[PDB]
Amino acid sequence: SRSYPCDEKKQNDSVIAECSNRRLQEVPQTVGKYVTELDLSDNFITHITNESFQGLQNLTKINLNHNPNVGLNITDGAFLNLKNLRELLLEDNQLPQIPSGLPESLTELSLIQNNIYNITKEGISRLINLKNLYLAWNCYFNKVCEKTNIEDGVFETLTNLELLSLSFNSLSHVPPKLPSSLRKLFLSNTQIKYISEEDFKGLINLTLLDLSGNCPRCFNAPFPCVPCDGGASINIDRFAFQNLTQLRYLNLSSTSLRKINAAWFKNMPHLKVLDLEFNYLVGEIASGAFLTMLPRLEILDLSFNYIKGSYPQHINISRNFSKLLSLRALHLRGYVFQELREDDFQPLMQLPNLSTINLGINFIKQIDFKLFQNFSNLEIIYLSENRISPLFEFDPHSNFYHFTRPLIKPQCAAYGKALDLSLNSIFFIGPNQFENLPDIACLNLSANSNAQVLSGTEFSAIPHVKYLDLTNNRLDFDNASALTELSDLEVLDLSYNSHYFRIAGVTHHLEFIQNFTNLKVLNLSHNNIYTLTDKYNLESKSLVELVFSGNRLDILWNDDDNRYISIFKGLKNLTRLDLSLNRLKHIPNEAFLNLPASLTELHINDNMLKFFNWTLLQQFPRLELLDLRGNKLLFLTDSLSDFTSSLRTLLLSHNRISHLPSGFLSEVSSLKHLDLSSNLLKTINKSALETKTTTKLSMLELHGNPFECTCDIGDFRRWMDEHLNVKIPRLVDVICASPGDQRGKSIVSLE
Amino acid sequence: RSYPCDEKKQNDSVIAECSNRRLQEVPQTVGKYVTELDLSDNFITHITNESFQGLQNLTKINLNHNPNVGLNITDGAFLNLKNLRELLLEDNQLPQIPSGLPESLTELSLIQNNIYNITKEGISRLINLKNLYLAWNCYFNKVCEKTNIEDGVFETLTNLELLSLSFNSLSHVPPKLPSSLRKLFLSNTQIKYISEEDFKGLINLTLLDLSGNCPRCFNAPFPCVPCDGGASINIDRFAFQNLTQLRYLNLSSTSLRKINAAWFKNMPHLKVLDLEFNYLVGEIASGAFLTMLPRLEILDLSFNYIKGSYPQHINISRNFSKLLSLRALHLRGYVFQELREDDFQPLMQLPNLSTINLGINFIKQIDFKLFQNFSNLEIIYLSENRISPLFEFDPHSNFYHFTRPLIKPQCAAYGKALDLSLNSIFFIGPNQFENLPDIACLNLSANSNAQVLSGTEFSAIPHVKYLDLTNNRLDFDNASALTELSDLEVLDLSYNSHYFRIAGVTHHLEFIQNFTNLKVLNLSHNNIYTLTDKYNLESKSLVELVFSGNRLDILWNDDDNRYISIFKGLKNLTRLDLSLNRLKHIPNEAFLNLPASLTELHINDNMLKFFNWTLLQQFPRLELLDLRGNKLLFLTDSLSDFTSSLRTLLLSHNRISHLPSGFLSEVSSLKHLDLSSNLLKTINKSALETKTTTKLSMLELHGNPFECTCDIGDFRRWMDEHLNVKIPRLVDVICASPGDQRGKSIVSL
Ligand SMILES: *[C@@H]1O[C@H](CO)[C@@H](O[C@@H]2O[C@H](CO)[C@@H](O[C@@H]3O[C@H](CO[C@H]4O[C@H](CO)[C@@H](O)[C@H](O)[C@@H]4O)[C@@H](O)[C@H](O[C@H]4O[C@H](CO)[C@@H](O)[C@H](O)[C@@H]4O)[C@@H]3O)[C@H](O)[C@H]2NC(C)=O)[C@H](O)[C@H]1NC(C)=O
Ligand SMILES: *[C@@H]1O[C@H](CO)[C@@H](O[C@@H]2O[C@H](CO)[C@@H](O[C@@H]3O[C@H](CO[C@H]4O[C@H](CO)[C@@H](O)[C@H](O)[C@@H]4O)[C@@H](O)[C@H](O[C@H]4O[C@H](CO)[C@@H](O)[C@H](O)[C@@H]4O)[C@@H]3O)[C@H](O)[C@H]2NC(C)=O)[C@H](O)[C@H]1NC(C)=O
Ligand SMILES: *[C@@H]1O[C@H](CO)[C@@H](O[C@@H]2O[C@H](CO)[C@@H](O[C@@H]3O[C@H](CO[C@H]4O[C@H](CO)[C@@H](O)[C@H](O)[C@@H]4O)[C@@H](O)[C@H](O[C@H]4O[C@H](CO)[C@@H](O)[C@H](O)[C@@H]4O)[C@@H]3O)[C@H](O)[C@H]2NC(C)=O)[C@H](O)[C@H]1NC(C)=O
Ligand SMILES: *[C@@H]1O[C@H](CO)[C@@H](O[C@@H]2O[C@H](CO)[C@@H](O[C@@H]3O[C@H](CO[C@H]4O[C@H](CO)[C@@H](O)[C@H](O)[C@@H]4O)[C@@H](O)[C@H](O[C@H]4O[C@H](CO)[C@@H](O)[C@H](O)[C@@H]4O)[C@@H]3O)[C@H](O)[C@H]2NC(C)=O)[C@H](O)[C@H]1NC(C)=O
Ligand SMILES: *[C@@H]1O[C@H](CO)[C@@H](O[C@@H]2O[C@H](CO)[C@@H](O[C@@H]3O[C@H](CO)[C@@H](O)[C@H](O)[C@@H]3O)[C@H](O)[C@H]2NC(C)=O)[C@H](O)[C@H]1NC(C)=O
Ligand SMILES: *[C@@H]1O[C@H](CO)[C@@H](O[C@@H]2O[C@H](CO)[C@@H](O[C@@H]3O[C@H](CO)[C@@H](O)[C@H](O)[C@@H]3O)[C@H](O)[C@H]2NC(C)=O)[C@H](O)[C@H]1NC(C)=O
Ligand SMILES: CCOCc1nc2c(N)nc3ccccc3c2n1CC(C)(C)O
Ligand SMILES: CCOCc1nc2c(N)nc3ccccc3c2n1CC(C)(C)O
Ligand SMILES: *[C@@H]1O[C@H](CO)[C@@H](O)[C@H](O)[C@H]1NC(C)=O
Ligand SMILES: *[C@@H]1O[C@H](CO)[C@@H](O)[C@H](O)[C@H]1NC(C)=O
Ligand SMILES: *[C@@H]1O[C@H](CO)[C@@H](O)[C@H](O)[C@H]1NC(C)=O
Ligand SMILES: *[C@@H]1O[C@H](CO)[C@@H](O)[C@H](O)[C@H]1NC(C)=O
Ligand SMILES: *[C@@H]1O[C@H](CO)[C@@H](O)[C@H](O)[C@H]1NC(C)=O
Ligand SMILES: *[C@@H]1O[C@H](CO)[C@@H](O)[C@H](O)[C@H]1NC(C)=O
Ligand SMILES: *[C@@H]1O[C@H](CO)[C@@H](O)[C@H](O)[C@H]1NC(C)=O
Ligand SMILES: *[C@@H]1O[C@H](CO)[C@@H](O)[C@H](O)[C@H]1NC(C)=O
Ligand SMILES: *[C@@H]1O[C@H](CO)[C@@H](O)[C@H](O)[C@H]1NC(C)=O
Numbered sequence A: 001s002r003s004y005p006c007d008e009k010k011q012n013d014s015v016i017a018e019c020s021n022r023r024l025q026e027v028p029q030t031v032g033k034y035v036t037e038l039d040l041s042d043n044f045i046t047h048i049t050n051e052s053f054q055g056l057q058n059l060t061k062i063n064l065n066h067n068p069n070v071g072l073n074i075t076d077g078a079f080l081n082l083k084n085l086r087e088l089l090l091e092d093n094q095l096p097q098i099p100s101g102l103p104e105s106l107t108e109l110s111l112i113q114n115n116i117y118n119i120t121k122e123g124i125s126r127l128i129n130l131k132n133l134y135l136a137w138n139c140y141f142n143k144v145c146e147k148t149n150i151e152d153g154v155f156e157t158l159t160n161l162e163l164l165s166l167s168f169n170s171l172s173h174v175p176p177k178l179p180s181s182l183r184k185l186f187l188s189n190t191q192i193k194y195i196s197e198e199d200f201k202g203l204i205n206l207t208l209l210d211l212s213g214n215c216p217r218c219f220n221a222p223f224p225c226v227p228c229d230g231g232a233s234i235n236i237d238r239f240a241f242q243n244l245t246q247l248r249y250l251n252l253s254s255t256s257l258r259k260i261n262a263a264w265f266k267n268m269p270h271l272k273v274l275d276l277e278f279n280y281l282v283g284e285i286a287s288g289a290f291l292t293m294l295p296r297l298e299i300l301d302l303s304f305n306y307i308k309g310s311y312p313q314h315i316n317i318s319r320n321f322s323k324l325l326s327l328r329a330l331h332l333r334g335y336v337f338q339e340l341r342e343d344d345f346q347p348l349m350q351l352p353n354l355s356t357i358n359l360g361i362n363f364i365k366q367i368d369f370k371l372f373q374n375f376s377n378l379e380i381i382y383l384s385e386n387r388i389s390p391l392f393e394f395d396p397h398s399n400f401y402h403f404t405r406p407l408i409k410p411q412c413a414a415y416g417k418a419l420d421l422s423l424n425s426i427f428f429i430g431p432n433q434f435e436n437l438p439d440i441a442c443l444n445l446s447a448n449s450n451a452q453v454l455s456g457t458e459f460s461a462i463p464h465v466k467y468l469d470l471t472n473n474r475l476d477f478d479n480a481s482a483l484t485e486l487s488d489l490e491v492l493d494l495s496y497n498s499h500y501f502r503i504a505g506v507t508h509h510l511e512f513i514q515n516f517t518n519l520k521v522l523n524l525s526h527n528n529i530y531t532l533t534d535k536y537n538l539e540s541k542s543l544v545e546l547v548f549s550g551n552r553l554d555i556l557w558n559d560d561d562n563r564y565i566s567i568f569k570g571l572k573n574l575t576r577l578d579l580s581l582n583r584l585k586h587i588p589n590e591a592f593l594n595l596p597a598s599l600t601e602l603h604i605n606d607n608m609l610k611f612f613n614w615t616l617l618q619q620f621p622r623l624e625l626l627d628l629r630g631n632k633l634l635f636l637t638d639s640l641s642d643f644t645s646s647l648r649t650l651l652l653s654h655n656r657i658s659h660l661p662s663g664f665l666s667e668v669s670s671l672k673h674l675d676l677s678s679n680l681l682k683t684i685n686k687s688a689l690e691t692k693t694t695t696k697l698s699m700l701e702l703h704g705n706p707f708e709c710t711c712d713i714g715d716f717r718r719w720m721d722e723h724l725n726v727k728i729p730r731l732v733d734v735i736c737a738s739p740g741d742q743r744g745k746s747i748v749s750l751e
Numbered sequence B: 001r002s003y004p005c006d007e008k009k010q011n012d013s014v015i016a017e018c019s020n021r022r023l024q025e026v027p028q029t030v031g032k033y034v035t036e037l038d039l040s041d042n043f044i045t046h047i048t049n050e051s052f053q054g055l056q057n058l059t060k061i062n063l064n065h066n067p068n069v070g071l072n073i074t075d076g077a078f079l080n081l082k083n084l085r086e087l088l089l090e091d092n093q094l095p096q097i098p099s100g101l102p103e104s105l106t107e108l109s110l111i112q113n114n115i116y117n118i119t120k121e122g123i124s125r126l127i128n129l130k131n132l133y134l135a136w137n138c139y140f141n142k143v144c145e146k147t148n149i150e151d152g153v154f155e156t157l158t159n160l161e162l163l164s165l166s167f168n169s170l171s172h173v174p175p176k177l178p179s180s181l182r183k184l185f186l187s188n189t190q191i192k193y194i195s196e197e198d199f200k201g202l203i204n205l206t207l208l209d210l211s212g213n214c215p216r217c218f219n220a221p222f223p224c225v226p227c228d229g230g231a232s233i234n235i236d237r238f239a240f241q242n243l244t245q246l247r248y249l250n251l252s253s254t255s256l257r258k259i260n261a262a263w264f265k266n267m268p269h270l271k272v273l274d275l276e277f278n279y280l281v282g283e284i285a286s287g288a289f290l291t292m293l294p295r296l297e298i299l300d301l302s303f304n305y306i307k308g309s310y311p312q313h314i315n316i317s318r319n320f321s322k323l324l325s326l327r328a329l330h331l332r333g334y335v336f337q338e339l340r341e342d343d344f345q346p347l348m349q350l351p352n353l354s355t356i357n358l359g360i361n362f363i364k365q366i367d368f369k370l371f372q373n374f375s376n377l378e379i380i381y382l383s384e385n386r387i388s389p390l391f392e393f394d395p396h397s398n399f400y401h402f403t404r405p406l407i408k409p410q411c412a413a414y415g416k417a418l419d420l421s422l423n424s425i426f427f428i429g430p431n432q433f434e435n436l437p438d439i440a441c442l443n444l445s446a447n448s449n450a451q452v453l454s455g456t457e458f459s460a461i462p463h464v465k466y467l468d469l470t471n472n473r474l475d476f477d478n479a480s481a482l483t484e485l486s487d488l489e490v491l492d493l494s495y496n497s498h499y500f501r502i503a504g505v506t507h508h509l510e511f512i513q514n515f516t517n518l519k520v521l522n523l524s525h526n527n528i529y530t531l532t533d534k535y536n537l538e539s540k541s542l543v544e545l546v547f548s549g550n551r552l553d554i555l556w557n558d559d560d561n562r563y564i565s566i567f568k569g570l571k572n573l574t575r576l577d578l579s580l581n582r583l584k585h586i587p588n589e590a591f592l593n594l595p596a597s598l599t600e601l602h603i604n605d606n607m608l609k610f611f612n613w614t615l616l617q618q619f620p621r622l623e624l625l626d627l628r629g630n631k632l633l634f635l636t637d638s639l640s641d642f643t644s645s646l647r648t649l650l651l652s653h654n655r656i657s658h659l660p661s662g663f664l665s666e667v668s669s670l671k672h673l674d675l676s677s678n679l680l681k682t683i684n685k686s687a688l689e690t691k692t693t694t695k696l697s698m699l700e701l702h703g704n705p706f707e708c709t710c711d712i713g714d715f716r717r718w719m720d721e722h723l724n725v726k727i728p729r730l731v732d733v734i735c736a737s738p739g740d741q742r743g744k745s746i747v748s749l
């Protein structure tokens, strides 16, 4: 009664089947009859018939995206027997037509990324319960494809349709006879040059309209882009939006706009998000009558409207920006200007809820920082990727014109006001650099090629920084007072500052670490640390997590050198230590015993350990997680229970373990998760996993072992049957390497 | 075929390379004709009379690093070897010098062991010794004993030329050294004092190494023990008075604060003087000793900085003008802020001075015009400063500095070289390079340069032929970039991915077409995936393009036609590196647009599941094709249909499962075929069918999971019948199955 090939998972009172990416040649007939959702994506399935899903009474969702994985044949009426089927994902299946006889019960159908150039009544009109219909990306770029034929009135019978996406197809015109139930209409990149008055006239419920990419701005496009003749603007009739009273979202990115008709927004009192990226609106940004029409606008994106070849001294912001009373975020990337002056952002300064200013990628050379102070509620000052100095490749489910990840890492932003100056050229922080700023909590100085010696005075003007990112610089740690002016500092990321650390002959000082009363997380990764000056030990009463990966503990803990034997011992509060990627072949016993007894989580993965002393776990009574993945370990103790009472997770994947000793699991009651995958186990003896006492083992990973599928595997097979509480994932990847004829088969399948 | 060793005859020598082979004992299958034998890095734990008992022809044995994961040698184990000359026993954890070693020995190496007693019984009867290495037996924080040197132990060694006792605790120079000595290494031996009598007899001495005695310990990257109070080594006035032939003196890290000029009174041929890691800032300023060295060619004064001191200027004595033969001056780690023209006046008088090394000095500013006032200056090494817009240790290498060239020989070969790497010249202004000499070789690597090169930046040094701009942030937004360098031949733009990764900014590589002499171009690791307006790279001159570590997977995406001819315009190209481009497949049209001139094509380390072999028809000059590290499972039936120029095919680290009939005899042009690390059970006779004999030379097959049954017999016969065909490391060509033959070489059955 152990499910195969799928993995069943409890989700919200129901069981779903995860069966994706398992090299399945066809729909498995062993799917649990009670499953409500079935993910069969990324397999090699080529055929779907009315026999594929028999008996699955309560199946509401099927994902068949990407079959076969590098044409899916679906018979007429194949899904008709599934009475509860609501959502059917058929993306990236090379479909030539919409499948015939789709179930009337469908509320969601996705046919994205196929070869469908004809939307017919035979295919669609009978699907009267459809709410969401995705037909995007069937004909686009330089793909060899036909222009899309939309049968007249095909969508007319879809009276519950709320979302229609037709983006990235050749449409030429907005389809007539759209149902008035529509809430979201996606028509991006459809080669529509003209929007008439009758196009959207009857869509009184529309909350989103996407017309982006029609008459695109094609200069420097990272895709094959074809402009309207002459690079003309999209042509939107004066009355084209007169009846869209409920509109909240309007995307007009890359429509080659030079002029925004203010009348378009006359009847849109709820417009909340306006996307105007990749146009030619520098003029409109400066004057902009339309800006007076949007008192409820929360997000305005005007990025990449730069004038080709133009590098003006200043940005020109209309006084009418002051009329955007509800504005929360303003995105002004790729405007391109040399200098940000205080008077230039005047109109923005009285906006009550404006919390985000995004000025990335403007080649700004200099800024008058005191201006941000004159704002009302600024939480995020994003100035990444400028020139500031001292003193299919496109995801069809993502935004096409910008990334959607947060501007600031949420862990950093959570502390408070953020200033992102990453990817600039602040190579030196002088006495006055950070004066007249707001109370910054989150400061990003990553990749500024800063080579200075932090001395303890640089951040004095912003003394309440909690999270400081100084990664990817070339910092010279030659002063024990470095960063000490930041008394409340909790997170310090110093990753990738290896420049000076790798030079044996210069001085290196890390003693400043001990000064902080509140420092919790310190990342020293990829710094090539192998030698320190005078003080060889890291010390801190507060530090909870140290990432020391990508350094040279192999040199630090070299047998002929005693000096670094206690390097981490003074981190009394430490619970997480990452020692991965340190080229470790062995850890001296005395060095290992000098690791903080307070550790709950220890990572030594991706080294070259040929040796591990399991006995030393006796000195780590709080240790819960031990990660030894990706080493060269051959040996497993048979006495683990004598060495730990606390270990919950033991990760041993990608090692050279070929034998599981008798009584390995005996009396280790704490162990919940054992990962032995990608090792050299040929079998598992009865006595290996046997126990008399209580065991809370709930996960055992074994995939990627060269199992011997003779009768010697019978005992473990029996053990699997008697322990269904113990999940073994990727059973299709738990594979017989022998005998010659049983090769490639799952061990779960054997007479 | 030799097993397990790889035996090769080289100019009146026969060498068996048997190293790193997991050997558990000395093989009895060594060829009798073998002279030099390398058994290093195996698991041999025992050496006896029986071990080499069959081999009387051995002149050289290397047993270093055995066993890799202590080596036991019986008394007289090597004694029956009459021709044994060189014996290498390094890193074997030997507790003593092996007893009964053969008197025929001329070189013996006991480096990196546990030997703490140097005795007559072990050494004194080895009369023919020239080179004796005993270094690194007791050092740093190793648990070990003081070295005992039995009185007169070296006295019978009257042919001894080289003696190395470095990194052992000696405390004194051993007495009664043979006068035949040419080189004496005594580094890091805790010798505080040098008397007049210590080197008295050594009339033939050309090298003396006394480094690391009374060391300078501040910031040492090793366990370092200073003399009491950090005092200097104590060298008597007359200590060197008889060292007439000396060419090399190493006094690095001996805590010298003073050099006695009289040390060099009788030393007229001294050539290399090493004074690193001392406290010689004062002597560098005065330096009476500088008058005593007319034939000195190399002088290393690196890392003599005063602790905590950061002076404005370097103080060079006028006496430096007396070093008329000086060729290289090394002044790293002196530490000063500014170099003025007047500070180097004494050096400008030196007729042959060709290298100045000022690395790691934290220099802020340089008056570059000073470099014009040198006649023979060929290397100006200013790497790793602060210039801005205007066991852990190899016992066989130098301990105090790296020995590699300061500047790549390929760069320096063009002429006067200037290395400004690892500085802060983040943009080049109009006057940055004025008053420089005529530079042929320029390194600007790692300067955080983010500027848009515009065609004027290098006008003052227009004859640069090799330009290294790696590891910067260059913004290629101008089509005239670098065009002022008419004679440019090698251009390295590796690791400037900063702006290439941003889609929204413009990217311009059109400048490549403007050079008439550009031969080699390195565009590696730039993450290039989009270009502005011009999608093609063009050059009539370019011979080599390195495009590794970019995004050809995106450039050659199925839905995009724009980059289909990206390399077509490189008409002279013979070598193209497309490695690390995340390629799952290459569009047929894209591959056909690769330059027909190609002789060498690397597509290694991608993710290719497919390769159209027929497309090789359009490459008549193709000789090397590198397809290593992909996912390929399919070879073409008939390869000679598609190529006749192919000399080398590298298919290792793929998923190849069967070899089509006729493959191994198919291509008359093929010499080297690499099938190592694939998925092979056998090579069938079908594949070995021969109308005509193969020109094959090398065939790599190691790492394949061969099944070992009577069906390989047909391949074994082919192995025996073709010996012109070299198949390397047969001990790693190994049966995977069945269990009894598992782990064994296919030649064993
Ligand atoms: C023009 O501008 C308009 C308005 O901004 C853009 O419209 C957005 O389009 C994007 C991309 O299609 C939409 O983002 C996607 O939304 C899907 C629906 O999410 C809804 O429901 C889920 C849960 O049911 C909620 O969590 C969510 O808040 C919504 O209520 C998501 O399923 C998508 O996420 C999935 O895919 C992404 C990308 O692979 C993964 O990262 C996720 O993990 C997940 O698997 C995705 O978030 C967005 O909803 C649209 N906005 C609105 C308001 O509808 C246009 O994209 C833009 N035009 C172009 C061409 O750029
Ligand atoms: C220098 O080193 C530091 C310290 O390690 C790194 O910063 C940490 O980065 C890790 C990721 O590697 C962060 O851990 C992840 O954080 C996410 C936090 O999500 C928050 O909100 C969610 C709900 O949305 C909550 O569940 C959660 O409590 C948080 O409040 C999690 O989503 C992640 O969990 C997922 O992945 C991990 C494996 O990576 C699994 O363990 C989880 O089960 C789950 O699958 C994860 O926890 C961590 O928060 C960062 N710490 C800080 C202080 O920022 C730096 O990235 C590193 N610098 C460099 C350059 O590498
Ligand atoms: C104090 O200063 C003195 C004077 O400079 C230093 O003396 C040098 O010491 C180094 C390091 O031991 C010597 O370098 C080694 O020389 C060996 C001898 O090679 C000679 O003969 C070979 C032919 O076999 C010639 O090719 C060569 O030109 C020489 O004539 C080499 O065999 C060594 O190379 C081997 O090991 C290295 C490193 O692993 C590899 O790179 C090579 O591939 C090779 O396998 C090595 O180069 C040097 O000879 C000494 N100088 C002189 C003139 O004798 C002291 O080292 C220094 N003290 C300290 C402690 O630094
Ligand atoms: C950007 O890309 C460029 C161009 O590829 C790189 O520059 C080249 O780097 C390679 C090293 O990978 C250099 O090739 C090497 O040259 C050495 C010097 O050759 C001299 O001596 C040989 C024989 O004595 C002569 O044939 C030659 O004329 C020279 O006089 C060789 O010793 C090396 O040989 C090694 O490889 C070959 C097989 O390829 C073997 O036969 C050898 O046994 C040995 O293993 C090698 O050929 C090359 O010289 C460089 N070219 C230039 C113009 O500098 C840059 O490194 C790269 N930049 C970055 C950052 O990666
Ligand atoms: C400080 O600024 C730097 C530079 O902008 C920020 O680095 C960027 O961080 C983001 C978020 O982690 C990275 O994007 C992510 O990459 C991962 C792995 O590729 C991907 O899985 C995510 O979906 C996301 O795309 C981005 O690569 C990185 N940029 C660079 C050049 O390093 C950093 O986050 C900032 N730090 C703080 C505290 O905000
Ligand atoms: C310009 O300056 C840069 C920075 O100094 C030079 O880079 C350095 O190049 C040397 C020579 O290749 C590297 O040393 C070598 O490394 C290889 C690979 O690890 C090793 O096999 C060799 O034995 C040798 O140690 C060195 O790592 C590298 N330094 C850095 C920081 O990249 C560059 O060579 C200079 N260019 C020219 C043309 O002189
Ligand atoms: C050859 C270097 O010896 C030690 C050293 N390390 C550093 C360092 N990490 N940074 C420095 C920054 C400015 C000036 C001097 C130094 C410096 N220095 C020089 C000095 C100030 C004399 O210690
Ligand atoms: C969002 C930018 O779009 C195009 C662009 N690319 C670059 C570039 N690679 N570098 C620049 C350097 C200085 C000033 C402007 C630019 C620039 N610019 C701006 C402009 C001068 C208008 O082309
Ligand atoms: C479908 O769901 C019902 C509960 O609504 C459940 O009783 C029934 O067993 C399920 N059918 C199958 C075949 O599992
Ligand atoms: C500002 O935001 C708050 C909620 O965060 C909202 O209640 C208020 O109406 C907003 N003010 C304006 C001017 O829209
Ligand atoms: C660190 O730098 C400050 C400011 O330059 C200086 O006052 C202090 O002496 C330095 N601390 C040291 C040398 O450890
Ligand atoms: C140790 O870490 C815990 C959890 O982060 C924290 O509450 C405590 O303040 C730390 N101890 C000290 C002494 O800072
Ligand atoms: C493991 O550690 C213990 C010290 O607790 C030591 O006695 C034992 O020798 C170690 N095992 C090995 C083989 O290093
Ligand atoms: C060395 O090898 C001999 C066998 O020739 C053995 O008898 C002796 O015990 C070994 N000595 C040591 C200490 O290993
Ligand atoms: C040593 O040198 C002096 C000359 O400086 C000479 O008188 C004496 O004979 C020499 N001794 C030897 C051993 O040659
Ligand atoms: C300088 O080197 C040249 C060889 O190019 C040589 O003729 C001359 O003797 C050298 N001069 C001195 C003073 O060593
Ligand atoms: C140039 O070098 C000569 C020695 O050849 C020296 O006498 C003179 O002072 C130098 N001139 C300058 C301007 O440094």
Ligand SMILES: *[C@@H]1O[C@H](CO)[C@@H](O)[C@H](O)[C@H]1NC(C)=O
Binding pocket: B454, B455, B477, B478, B479, B480
């Ligand atoms: C490149 O830069 C130079 C100097 O600014 C300028 O004159 C020229 O117009 C530029 N070339 C272009 C934009 O192609």
Ligand SMILES: *[C@@H]1O[C@H](CO)[C@@H](O)[C@H](O)[C@H]1NC(C)=O
Binding pocket: B516, B519, B540, B541, B542, B543, B572
């Ligand atoms: C082709 O390359 C070689 C250099 O390897 C050169 O001799 C020849 O001039 C090049 N062809 C042209 C047109 O530059």
Ligand SMILES: *[C@@H]1O[C@H](CO)[C@@H](O)[C@H](O)[C@H]1NC(C)=O
Binding pocket: B588, B612, B613, B614, B615
């Ligand atoms: C290989 O390329 C040739 C074009 O010359 C084409 O005819 C053939 O179909 C291609 N083979 C494959 C499998 O793509």
